[PDB]
Amino acid sequence: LKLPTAPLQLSGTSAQIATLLWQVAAKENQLDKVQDELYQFIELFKQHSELRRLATDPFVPTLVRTKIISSVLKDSGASEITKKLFEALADEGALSALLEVTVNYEELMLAHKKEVYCTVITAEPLDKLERVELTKKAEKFVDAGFKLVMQEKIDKKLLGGFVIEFSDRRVDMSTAKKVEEFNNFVNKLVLSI
């Protein structure tokens, strides 16, 4: 057999269910169809107490817990892979793993969407050419066809330049950093001679 590659490698036992749920929804091309009905079940657990009793109660029988699931998923937005999932998650009492498996499904999705939720901190509010050439500067820190959306903030203790915050990675192209690194360099080098 074969399966499409995941966009990002990630964690175990709830993030490998989400990798496989992404790996069969990429083959059936319903990648954003499975994602919203994952959000529907989270809303279904919000307003139904008898549906979350099939996820948290240890005393529900494993046959009763899997027969309510198949008797409410009958060919209406079924998608055959969020329907065969929920039998397999009620076969083992893992319906409580849904709030964990959709979070990993989302972070697999925007890596497929090629978007990175950036953040830029600049000393003063930007011009429309500072924005454009800052955008062209910032695509060297994402090594794909990755789009950036920005959340531009203001910090006057930066003396120009900018600080990029990728929420897992920070690039400090500000000039306060440049003058303090310059001072560290020249205060180190005169001790070397």
Partner: peptide
């Protein structure tokens, strides 16, 4: 909030992926 009981999942099997992999790869047509 009422979904903090679904915040922490707990599994009766380490090989939970081996059952959903037997129920999802024959669920692609």
């Amino acid at each position: 909030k009422a979904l903090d009981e679904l915040r922490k999942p707990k599994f009766s099997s380490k090989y939970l992926i081996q059952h959903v992999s037997q129920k999802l790869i024959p669920a692609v047509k």
